[PDB]
Point group: C3
Chain length 155, copies 3
C-alpha cells in the first residue's frame, strides 16, 4: 500500500455502568431489561474513557463517543457507531470512526473496520481488534483492550 505513515494504537476502553458517574446512558429499551444482558433493540449512548493501561486511573488518552445497539435476537451482540477521539498524545484532536459489529459473547478477538478518520487520520485506512480485559455481565461494566493499526498521511 501507498500510505506515508503507519501507527499502532493501543489503549483500554471503559464502559462504566455502575458507580456515581456512569459513562453511558440508556437511549431506548424497547424490550425492557433482562438479567445479565441487553435485549434486542436496546440503544446506549457512551462517553467512554480511553486509557493507556487497563486501570481506570491510568493515563487518559481519549474518548470513545457514540452509540451501541443490541442487534441480535439470539445472543447479545452489539453494533458500535462511534468515534475515538484522542486528547493527550501524538494526535490531539484527531479522530477515528467505527461502524462495526461487536459479538461480545461469541468472539474473543473482535475486528472492527476503521471507516474514516480526521486530523492526523484524514484519509485513514485501518482496522481495530478488541478483546476483553474484564467484563461483568451482571452490571455491564467492561474494560476492553484495543489495538488499532492505521495507515495515514502527513499532517
Amino acid at each position: 500500500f501507498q500510505e506515508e505513515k503507519f501507527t499502532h494504537l493501543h489503549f483500554y476502553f471503559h464502559d462504566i455502568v455502575t458507580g456515581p458517574k456512569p459513562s453511558m446512558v440508556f437511549v431506548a429499551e424497547p424490550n425492557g431489561k433482562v438479567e445479565n444482558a441487553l435485549p434486542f433493540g436496546t440503544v446506549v449512548a457512551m462517553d467512554d474513557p480511553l486509557t493507556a493501561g487497563p486501570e481506570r486511573d491510568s493515563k487518559l488518552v481519549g474518548k470513545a463517543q457514540g452509540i451501541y445497539t443490541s442487534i441480535s435476537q439470539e445472543e447479545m451482540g452489539l453494533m458500535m457507531v462511534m468515534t475515538m477521539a484522542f486528547s493527550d498524545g501524538e494526535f490531539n484532536g484527531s479522530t477515528l470512526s467505527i461502524l462495526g459489529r461487536n459479538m461480545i459473547m461469541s468472539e474473543t478477538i473482535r475486528e472492527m473496520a476503521i471507516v474514516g478518520g480526521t486530523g492526523a487520520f484524514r484519509f485513514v485506512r485501518g482496522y481495530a481488534q478488541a478483546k476483553f480485559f474484564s467484563v461483568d455481565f451482571t452490571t455491564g461494566d467492561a474494560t476492553v483492550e484495543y489495538d488499532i493499526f492505521v495507515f495515514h498521511y502527513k499532517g
Copy 2:
C-alpha cells in the same frame, strides 16, 4: 485499481415484520404510527436474514444487523446503518458495513456505499445495489435483492 481480489455477492435481505418471530423491533416512534409508512424519525433495529434465494427458507448466508431510520419528511426514505455478516459460505465471520440512504419509494435500484469491511473484507472498496423482490407497505414485510461488488485482499 490495485486490489488483489474481486467478489460479486448476491443475496436476498428479509425484513420480517409480521408473524410470530419478527426480525425487527421498533426502537423509537416519535411521530407514532401511520398507515402504510414509517413516520419521520422512526427508528427500527433489525436482525435480518440474508438468503441465497428470494425464498425465506432458501439457504441462510448471513444477517443484516443494525438500525434503519425514517429520514424524510416528504416521502418514506430510510437511512441504513448496519453490517452484513456472512456465516455459511466463502467468508464466514467476515462483515461489510453500510451507512447509506435508501429511498425505497422513489428509486427502483438503490446504491449504498460499502464504508468498511472485516476479515476477508478488511480494507474493502465496494458498493451495493438493492432492489425489491417483494414489498408490502401495509405491513412492512420486504424481501430485497442485493448485489454487492467488493474489491479486497488476501486473508
Copy 3:
C-alpha cells in the same frame, strides 16, 4: 493520489428547530431537556436543507438526512450519522456519508471524514470542514457552512 476527479463542494446546512415546519424531530431524550443545550444521550433525526447561500431561501442543492446524538457529558458535542444527498446541480442523486464527531462548542472549524459516497461519489475519498454561519443555542436553530473536498471517479 490516483483519483480521476476532484470536486470542491460548498453549501450551507440548516437545522431548523423553530417555526411551523421544523426540519428535525427528537427521537429520544433520556435526560430530558435543559436550557440552551441537548443533554447527553439525546438523539435527533434531521431532514435538513442544504442551500447554495447562507440564506434559507437561497438555491436548494440537497438534504442532510440522518441522526445526531449528544455524546459528551461535559459539554455539548454531537455525533453526526448522516448522508448528504444532492438534487439540483452536477451530481443529482449522488450522496456522501458522514460518521463524525462534531464539537460545536469547542471547535470553530470542525472536520468530518467522508466515509462513503454513491453515484458520482462512488469510491470517494474526502473530508468536510464545517463552521457556523449562525447559531442560536436557546432554540437550536443553526446555519452551518460546509466545505467538502472529494476525490472520485468518472460516472
